[PDB]
């Protein structure tokens, strides 16, 4: 007690007081006695001792009042009292009675100090003041908090510490208005008096702070419109009293706390606007603009009903000055525009938002002159002329856009404004292009549009908006720019496409959706960011969408190797995108071009030692030195001093393989030992690997654990194959190589002395070591080993087997069947397999075994129904391919294999493949497990130790990826958390199943193969049907798929295997799709017959076995839903077996849909008329006669055919009368009735009727013109009308009428013979009977016209168009009522493109036939004018009443766009020729004309106007050439008109001496330079002025944007001028003094030929395509053509060879192409050598190598597969261009007129000046070749010419041409008989020759040669040495 208090009187002794006071009455005064005398270290500690114990009653609070000795000594004693009052809470003494007044008195002393005491006296005073209600202290404490604190010298935090005190205590006593009154009274008193002094600033503003404090709590009093009067009284003392420019911080914020209490009741705005507009006086101060901009928002909060006009007009140049570096108010100025934007009074918005938009549209024109853009696309602009001319435009746009955000914010249920949503599109043309070059305003506009469209995205009030987004999302997606915009574009698109599905018909836009998906096709590869590709592959994974998917397949095919998580996204995309469209390209050509460009530079940078690691990974199993390190190894180079921005991934693998070979080409290889050891090391890596296939050994090449190392073993083999290929490419530095590399390199010190071909010839085991993983990796070496050895039994079996593995090129396999001349029948049947008729080609393989063995067919092979569609001991093993053909789907071998056991019982050896795979399958889920357990299954009992690791060689994974699916499928039946152990074993199987599609991109391959992609989709189906019970997709879907060949195995045979098991378990909708997998396998066709009956037995009902009695099994069986497509396939199946039993079933199935809604009735009849077309039936006429005569005979087929066509009365207006029947012609008459019955209901059913109707109409009206014909009905009228006199004369009158009426001014002749015999009114009957007798005669053509019209309405159309054009102009008298009423009323409409021949028919000799042609031309010009342009503009410069009526309608729309092209045509006609220097060409024909006058000049002067007047004819031209030149536009009078006046001073008025000076002074300019022509600033400078134009179609079927680059003189020939166009790039050239009108008809004929191959151009991998040539005539003797695509001439590789030979000879040009033939023909007139030319030609063919082109396409292809595609496309394109050239006129084919595309392998041809057999009219050493078959084109195929792949593709061209021969003969009939072509006794001979060449009557007009015979005759003559030796020296027959 007393002891601690005495010890307290040292720092450690006072801390014990805290514990001693808790356990007294003497410790109360100890705090007053000790804490008031000590220092600072022991002062605040004593105040916390008795703070909560005792006592604060009488002795702990009273002594503190007497502590006035010092301020700091009392600061620690005044707070402890209130601390105890808060801690005790009895409450005995806490805010008590008058005893507390002491503290109030202490408040009087707080103002004397710095108010430090109030920090602890006023924070605890009101907290204990309840209740205890006290309110009288507020008026006692506020006397010094605002009056004394007015100038207390900061006095800054005290003002904010005193305002919070007036809340708790001031909450009560709501009658505090007296305080406001007494404050405002003194405020007004101090404001009134007296003048501007220091007294009116300290105590004048501080009182205003009272209004900021006392108004804090007073919010409930009272209120009755008193605050309005308060504001009225407060506003005045600050308006007219200052006038002083003092501080208004507390003055401007005074109404802030007062005017916020009312919202819309009433205000004094008439005295407030001036209070708010006058204050913003720029510019003071930085801290003063806040409380001046806040009252704007305060007023706008209360301005919602009464506000208009000038209050918004004060925002032009008043408050916008605060938009600068001052950041203290930059955010305080961006609040008012939002506060005025949405609220309120939309009438005020029409001013505010319009001013904002005018300011926005007035800043972009300021940036105009800096960029010289358009001016200015202004719609919502006002009169505000502000010139910033600084960087303030960016800020003015950004602030305005950020302020306009609140307009597009929810909800905003009103749109009376200018649709700010459309403001982002109405200006989208200017600020979104450059803008490049701005560059952030586009980003800001995109952010604004995104923020506007996030709240509402799509609903279908505006409806076009939901369709205008995509329309503007595509134009802004790929104008490649900075990456700051794509991050938002790909996000907006990903947010839009998600809501598209989650609507519903928005996919069919169609112009919006078909363009919104094209930008994803480009944004999915570039650039490499790893963030946008995930926002595109996922954004496109949900949509399909409707039309285009091949682009997605071309993207994913090159996107599965990024070595990033995007691989999984692309896999998930391609696994569920779609099937049968892979297997249906664009991006593969980009990889091809990137690989073909890196080999040309030949850079030597890497590597000396780093290249040795690229060989260890391929040859050995060592890892990468680590990680993939591909990008690192690529970036280590260059290092300079090229590939695009993809760099993943094959582009790096191929580059590394090529670099490791550019390093290996030098002699001393650093990667390995010397050359003689490196060659051995490479040879041993294949000699110990090729023998592994016919054996079973182990090596580190195939056994590599663990995955992924077994699936990476195929990559090693592919890399080694590509390494060898590129080595053979680079080892050609001895020929040397062509312009690909330099030659290849200098390299002429060892590569010429040493020969590495002896090693390649002795190491050709690559045919076996590279045929397993890759197909085309063996043909490159097989076609080089088999061509130099001119064994053969083993080297040939590895050739036909490789071509069979390709699943294509079956036409090239027939070459070896005709190649047996070089020292058998096995190849003739080995090529009959693909040929996808695995059912067939089995007999011929077994037939090739006799008599070398047994019969080999165990029970049968059913050969009788299969033809209606040396002891080497090595070929017998190849016959094992039978097990790969017949078994894999038709197993059979269960007995047939035993037939081998006997066959192997007598000889050795005859081995086969594994048998467990065939014993496990199929249809059994119990024995399958026991059969799979015996193999290498190591199955899982219900990663990365899966099925096998030794050996599992290359290409065997297909057999391993199908045995796994059989395990998890049997587990699904054994079982049904449980399948959780299966998804971890299947999802990992997809990682190893997609390695065959990943190796399909090394180095570059096409969609091949398709036998391994099915195991990927069917595995995704299993992994999808495992997590659930299969309630939806996948199924999978394998519907057409009009591929169409696509061999069923393993496409369909491996798809119906798992699909049948998926349906065999029923413990959704897996029964309707299952029939689609069989119906698409029954129609095979062509021609698996044995594999076409199992699906028929599984579809409807099962059948045990049939040896040919299928007709008795499935015939006349009616069914119901679903679709009956399974019926029309059984009849077509019986067609291949029977002939009369199939038509009966067809006609029976015709009577089925008689009462039905299915359109299949349009396919049966149209599919049956071909069966009953030919030829032995001949019973239709008898059946018709019987029907007309009580039919009782004979067969059921005729009865059914007559009962199916009799339904025409129960269902193209009227059917047959029939007057066109046997009475006049058409004896059959039944096929026409069937074609007419097949009209129901609507596309390919009308063309079949028209082709018959028009044919039989043209085959009757021509026959009736020679004879006559009349029916009984039209002849009885004349007999009953001509009474009385006599009918004997009528007997001949009828014959005369029948003869004359069918002979079709012409109608009037019908009366000439009328009055010649009778001679009697009755004049109208002679004009009515003569037209009724010709009505039915001309009725077969009206039905044809109606059928063609109905076919054009429903969408070949060219055939119908040509037939209608040939029928309209032939005889317009009939049918005029059908042609005039159908051609002018929506014919097709129109029938663009390729047939514009109406222009040639406008100048017809008959009236009323052009009135419809002009209307149709006006229609085709008004609708889609871009299809045909320059239609009559050329014609109007050089019938004349039609070009104007066309051009006026063409110019009605966009007259500027047609005026531009008119001026362009005028300039193109003015630049030609020019004829300024061409006048010498007129003088160049004066060899003996002008000289004769000389003979008179020396005659008149010797004998002493006839001589001077003889040259008067030349004066008319000498003056004409000077008169046409009268205005290098300004320099033409100085460069052209230089001495033109001084040259005719004597020649024109009178030896013609001044004639050669002008011809010699201009000829020197041609020899000075090559292209002696200036730029577009030439004589025609308008081309350089039109820097922009609309769509003009520069001779195409869009990019004519500004101007071409420059023109060239082309000194090669005369007179081409190659120029560009550089459209939105396209080289063209002019041709003058040459009629370019027939060359357009030639290209039209070529296009008509190419549109007929499209029906068969479906895989068809070597697509039939004749290269077109875009030409356009620019008047008579003027035209414009295209120059060239990417293609090098065939003469270049010969001139380069000559140069290389000259350089090689110089190391021990001319050539010349014309001087070399004379260098050897010397030592031998017309002449007749003759007989020496055939011998001298062999002396030149044995000098040039025959592989000048074969080694060019081989060197221009990096991959061994691209080379195969190029060589297969070249042999197809050459055959196409040669069979068209053999027909019409193509001759004089030099090495300059025939080019070749080095990229795709196609062959293009230059314009044909000589055509239509004009090559036989010379007047030159005569040549008769039907094509080009030189030495360097015959050896370009795989083996030869015949019967090689190039022959079998020529026989199909003649078949497709003779089948549509008329369609060509009708074209020539319109090509010839012209008005402007100027080819008439010559235009008929060419047409007759073309008809004879198409009818095979070329040489013998009495025998019809077959297609194969004609092809052989044309090939034997084109390659004969006799015809190839009598050609011109310039043709280069030896080369």
Short mmCIF file of N, CA and C in Angstrom, two decimals, residues 162-250:
data_model
loop_
_atom_site.label_atom_id
_atom_site.label_comp_id
_atom_site.label_asym_id
_atom_site.label_seq_id
_atom_site.Cartn_x
_atom_site.Cartn_y
_atom_site.Cartn_z
N UNK A 162 -12.22 20.23 -35.69
CA UNK A 162 -13.33 20.86 -34.99
C UNK A 162 -14.67 20.66 -35.69
N UNK A 163 -14.66 20.34 -36.99
CA UNK A 163 -15.91 20.14 -37.71
C UNK A 163 -16.57 18.81 -37.34
N UNK A 164 -15.77 17.77 -37.10
CA UNK A 164 -16.33 16.49 -36.70
C UNK A 164 -16.89 16.53 -35.28
N UNK A 165 -16.47 17.50 -34.47
CA UNK A 165 -17.01 17.62 -33.12
C UNK A 165 -18.45 18.12 -33.14
N UNK A 166 -18.84 18.83 -34.20
CA UNK A 166 -20.19 19.35 -34.31
C UNK A 166 -21.15 18.38 -34.94
N UNK A 167 -20.96 17.08 -34.70
CA UNK A 167 -21.85 16.05 -35.19
C UNK A 167 -22.56 15.32 -34.06
N UNK A 168 -21.81 14.74 -33.13
CA UNK A 168 -22.42 13.94 -32.07
C UNK A 168 -23.26 14.81 -31.14
N UNK A 169 -22.65 15.87 -30.59
CA UNK A 169 -23.39 16.73 -29.68
C UNK A 169 -24.41 17.59 -30.41
N UNK A 170 -24.14 17.94 -31.67
CA UNK A 170 -25.05 18.78 -32.44
C UNK A 170 -26.15 18.00 -33.14
N UNK A 171 -26.16 16.67 -33.03
CA UNK A 171 -27.26 15.90 -33.60
C UNK A 171 -28.59 16.27 -32.97
N UNK A 172 -28.61 16.43 -31.65
CA UNK A 172 -29.80 16.87 -30.95
C UNK A 172 -29.95 18.39 -31.07
N UNK A 173 -30.94 18.93 -30.37
CA UNK A 173 -31.25 20.36 -30.39
C UNK A 173 -31.48 20.84 -31.83
N UNK A 174 -32.53 20.30 -32.44
CA UNK A 174 -32.83 20.58 -33.84
C UNK A 174 -33.21 22.03 -34.09
N UNK A 175 -33.45 22.82 -33.05
CA UNK A 175 -33.79 24.23 -33.20
C UNK A 175 -32.54 25.11 -33.18
N UNK A 176 -31.59 24.80 -34.06
CA UNK A 176 -30.33 25.52 -34.14
C UNK A 176 -30.31 26.57 -35.24
N UNK A 177 -31.47 26.98 -35.74
CA UNK A 177 -31.52 28.01 -36.78
C UNK A 177 -31.11 29.38 -36.25
N UNK A 178 -31.23 29.60 -34.94
CA UNK A 178 -30.77 30.86 -34.37
C UNK A 178 -29.27 31.05 -34.57
N UNK A 179 -28.50 29.95 -34.53
CA UNK A 179 -27.07 30.04 -34.80
C UNK A 179 -26.84 30.51 -36.23
N UNK A 180 -27.55 29.92 -37.19
CA UNK A 180 -27.44 30.36 -38.58
C UNK A 180 -27.79 31.84 -38.72
N UNK A 181 -28.86 32.28 -38.06
CA UNK A 181 -29.28 33.67 -38.16
C UNK A 181 -28.22 34.61 -37.60
N UNK A 182 -27.71 34.31 -36.40
CA UNK A 182 -26.72 35.18 -35.77
C UNK A 182 -25.40 35.17 -36.52
N UNK A 183 -25.08 34.07 -37.21
CA UNK A 183 -23.86 34.03 -38.00
C UNK A 183 -24.03 34.85 -39.28
N UNK A 184 -25.15 34.65 -39.98
CA UNK A 184 -25.36 35.34 -41.25
C UNK A 184 -25.56 36.84 -41.05
N UNK A 185 -26.12 37.25 -39.91
CA UNK A 185 -26.27 38.68 -39.65
C UNK A 185 -24.91 39.37 -39.58
N UNK A 186 -24.00 38.84 -38.76
CA UNK A 186 -22.67 39.42 -38.68
C UNK A 186 -21.90 39.25 -39.98
N UNK A 187 -22.16 38.17 -40.72
CA UNK A 187 -21.51 37.99 -42.02
C UNK A 187 -21.90 39.10 -42.98
N UNK A 188 -23.20 39.39 -43.08
CA UNK A 188 -23.66 40.47 -43.95
C UNK A 188 -23.16 41.82 -43.45
N UNK A 189 -23.10 42.00 -42.12
CA UNK A 189 -22.60 43.26 -41.57
C UNK A 189 -21.14 43.49 -41.94
N UNK A 190 -20.32 42.44 -41.84
CA UNK A 190 -18.91 42.56 -42.22
C UNK A 190 -18.71 42.60 -43.73
N UNK A 191 -19.68 42.11 -44.50
CA UNK A 191 -19.57 42.18 -45.96
C UNK A 191 -19.96 43.55 -46.49
N UNK A 192 -20.91 44.23 -45.84
CA UNK A 192 -21.36 45.53 -46.34
C UNK A 192 -20.27 46.58 -46.20
N UNK A 193 -19.54 46.57 -45.09
CA UNK A 193 -18.54 47.59 -44.80
C UNK A 193 -17.16 46.95 -44.66
N UNK A 194 -16.13 47.68 -45.10
CA UNK A 194 -16.30 48.96 -45.77
C UNK A 194 -15.68 48.97 -47.17
N UNK A 195 -14.44 48.51 -47.27
CA UNK A 195 -13.70 48.54 -48.53
C UNK A 195 -12.74 47.35 -48.56
N UNK A 196 -12.05 47.17 -49.69
CA UNK A 196 -11.11 46.06 -49.85
C UNK A 196 -9.92 46.25 -48.92
N UNK A 197 -9.88 45.49 -47.84
CA UNK A 197 -8.78 45.56 -46.88
C UNK A 197 -8.51 44.17 -46.33
N UNK A 198 -7.49 44.09 -45.46
CA UNK A 198 -7.15 42.83 -44.81
C UNK A 198 -8.16 42.43 -43.75
N UNK A 199 -9.06 43.34 -43.35
CA UNK A 199 -10.07 43.00 -42.36
C UNK A 199 -11.21 42.19 -42.96
N UNK A 200 -11.41 42.28 -44.28
CA UNK A 200 -12.49 41.59 -44.96
C UNK A 200 -12.05 40.29 -45.62
N UNK A 201 -10.98 39.67 -45.13
CA UNK A 201 -10.54 38.39 -45.66
C UNK A 201 -10.35 37.33 -44.58
N UNK A 202 -9.90 37.72 -43.38
CA UNK A 202 -9.68 36.76 -42.31
C UNK A 202 -11.00 36.38 -41.63
N UNK A 203 -11.68 37.36 -41.04
CA UNK A 203 -12.94 37.11 -40.36
C UNK A 203 -14.13 37.06 -41.31
N UNK A 204 -13.92 37.32 -42.60
CA UNK A 204 -15.02 37.27 -43.56
C UNK A 204 -15.22 35.86 -44.11
N UNK A 205 -14.12 35.13 -44.35
CA UNK A 205 -14.23 33.79 -44.92
C UNK A 205 -14.42 32.73 -43.84
N UNK A 206 -13.79 32.93 -42.67
CA UNK A 206 -13.88 31.94 -41.61
C UNK A 206 -15.32 31.70 -41.18
N UNK A 207 -16.12 32.77 -41.11
CA UNK A 207 -17.53 32.60 -40.77
C UNK A 207 -18.26 31.73 -41.78
N UNK A 208 -17.85 31.80 -43.06
CA UNK A 208 -18.43 30.92 -44.06
C UNK A 208 -18.18 29.46 -43.73
N UNK A 209 -17.03 29.16 -43.11
CA UNK A 209 -16.76 27.79 -42.69
C UNK A 209 -17.79 27.29 -41.69
N UNK A 210 -18.41 28.21 -40.94
CA UNK A 210 -19.52 27.83 -40.06
C UNK A 210 -20.64 27.20 -40.88
N UNK A 211 -20.98 27.81 -42.01
CA UNK A 211 -21.96 27.23 -42.91
C UNK A 211 -21.55 25.88 -43.45
N UNK A 212 -20.26 25.55 -43.40
CA UNK A 212 -19.80 24.23 -43.79
C UNK A 212 -19.89 23.24 -42.64
N UNK A 213 -19.82 23.72 -41.40
CA UNK A 213 -19.82 22.84 -40.24
C UNK A 213 -21.21 22.65 -39.65
N UNK A 214 -21.90 23.75 -39.34
CA UNK A 214 -23.20 23.65 -38.69
C UNK A 214 -24.23 22.99 -39.60
N UNK A 215 -24.05 23.09 -40.92
CA UNK A 215 -24.94 22.42 -41.86
C UNK A 215 -24.63 20.94 -42.03
N UNK A 216 -23.59 20.43 -41.36
CA UNK A 216 -23.27 19.01 -41.44
C UNK A 216 -24.36 18.16 -40.79
N UNK A 217 -24.70 18.47 -39.54
CA UNK A 217 -25.70 17.70 -38.81
C UNK A 217 -27.12 18.17 -39.06
N UNK A 218 -27.33 19.46 -39.27
CA UNK A 218 -28.66 20.01 -39.49
C UNK A 218 -29.12 19.66 -40.90
N UNK A 219 -29.88 18.57 -41.02
CA UNK A 219 -30.39 18.13 -42.32
C UNK A 219 -31.89 17.87 -42.20
N UNK A 220 -32.39 17.80 -40.96
CA UNK A 220 -33.79 17.51 -40.70
C UNK A 220 -34.61 18.75 -40.38
N UNK A 221 -33.97 19.90 -40.19
CA UNK A 221 -34.66 21.14 -39.83
C UNK A 221 -34.65 22.08 -41.02
N UNK A 222 -35.84 22.39 -41.54
CA UNK A 222 -37.09 21.83 -41.02
C UNK A 222 -37.85 20.93 -42.02
N UNK A 223 -38.13 21.36 -43.26
CA UNK A 223 -37.80 22.66 -43.84
C UNK A 223 -38.97 23.15 -44.70
N UNK A 224 -39.25 24.45 -44.65
CA UNK A 224 -40.31 25.07 -45.46
C UNK A 224 -39.69 26.21 -46.26
N UNK A 225 -39.14 25.87 -47.44
CA UNK A 225 -38.57 26.78 -48.43
C UNK A 225 -37.76 27.91 -47.80
N UNK A 226 -37.03 27.62 -46.72
CA UNK A 226 -36.18 28.61 -46.09
C UNK A 226 -34.76 28.60 -46.63
N UNK A 227 -34.28 27.45 -47.10
CA UNK A 227 -32.93 27.38 -47.66
C UNK A 227 -32.82 28.21 -48.94
N UNK A 228 -33.93 28.37 -49.67
CA UNK A 228 -33.91 29.24 -50.84
C UNK A 228 -33.62 30.68 -50.45
N UNK A 229 -34.30 31.18 -49.41
CA UNK A 229 -34.02 32.53 -48.93
C UNK A 229 -32.63 32.63 -48.33
N UNK A 230 -32.15 31.57 -47.68
CA UNK A 230 -30.79 31.57 -47.16
C UNK A 230 -29.78 31.74 -48.29
N UNK A 231 -29.95 30.97 -49.37
CA UNK A 231 -29.06 31.10 -50.52
C UNK A 231 -29.19 32.47 -51.17
N UNK A 232 -30.42 33.01 -51.24
CA UNK A 232 -30.61 34.34 -51.79
C UNK A 232 -29.86 35.39 -50.99
N UNK A 233 -29.85 35.25 -49.66
CA UNK A 233 -29.13 36.20 -48.81
C UNK A 233 -27.62 35.97 -48.82
N UNK A 234 -27.17 34.75 -49.11
CA UNK A 234 -25.74 34.47 -49.09
C UNK A 234 -25.08 34.81 -50.42
N UNK A 235 -25.83 34.73 -51.53
CA UNK A 235 -25.22 34.95 -52.84
C UNK A 235 -24.78 36.40 -53.03
N UNK A 236 -25.57 37.35 -52.53
CA UNK A 236 -25.30 38.76 -52.82
C UNK A 236 -23.97 39.28 -52.27
N UNK A 237 -23.58 39.01 -51.02
CA UNK A 237 -22.33 39.60 -50.51
C UNK A 237 -21.06 39.10 -51.18
N UNK A 238 -21.15 38.24 -52.19
CA UNK A 238 -19.97 37.77 -52.91
C UNK A 238 -19.96 38.15 -54.38
N UNK A 239 -21.09 38.58 -54.94
CA UNK A 239 -21.14 38.93 -56.36
C UNK A 239 -20.62 40.34 -56.60
N UNK A 240 -21.25 41.33 -55.98
CA UNK A 240 -20.89 42.73 -56.19
C UNK A 240 -19.82 43.22 -55.22
N UNK A 241 -19.46 42.43 -54.22
CA UNK A 241 -18.45 42.84 -53.25
C UNK A 241 -17.04 42.39 -53.62
N UNK A 242 -16.90 41.51 -54.61
CA UNK A 242 -15.59 41.01 -55.02
C UNK A 242 -15.68 40.60 -56.49
N UNK A 243 -15.15 41.42 -57.41
CA UNK A 243 -14.60 42.80 -57.29
C UNK A 243 -13.32 42.98 -56.47
N UNK A 244 -12.78 41.90 -55.89
CA UNK A 244 -11.49 41.97 -55.20
C UNK A 244 -10.52 40.89 -55.65
N UNK A 245 -10.99 39.78 -56.24
CA UNK A 245 -10.13 38.68 -56.68
C UNK A 245 -9.35 38.08 -55.51
N UNK A 246 -10.06 37.78 -54.43
CA UNK A 246 -9.49 37.10 -53.28
C UNK A 246 -9.67 35.59 -53.43
N UNK A 247 -9.48 34.86 -52.34
CA UNK A 247 -9.69 33.41 -52.35
C UNK A 247 -11.17 33.12 -52.17
N UNK A 248 -11.72 32.28 -53.05
CA UNK A 248 -13.12 31.89 -53.00
C UNK A 248 -13.29 30.40 -52.75
N UNK A 249 -12.33 29.76 -52.08
CA UNK A 249 -12.44 28.33 -51.82
C UNK A 249 -13.63 28.02 -50.92
N UNK A 250 -13.74 28.73 -49.79
CA UNK A 250 -14.85 28.50 -48.88
C UNK A 250 -16.12 29.20 -49.35
#
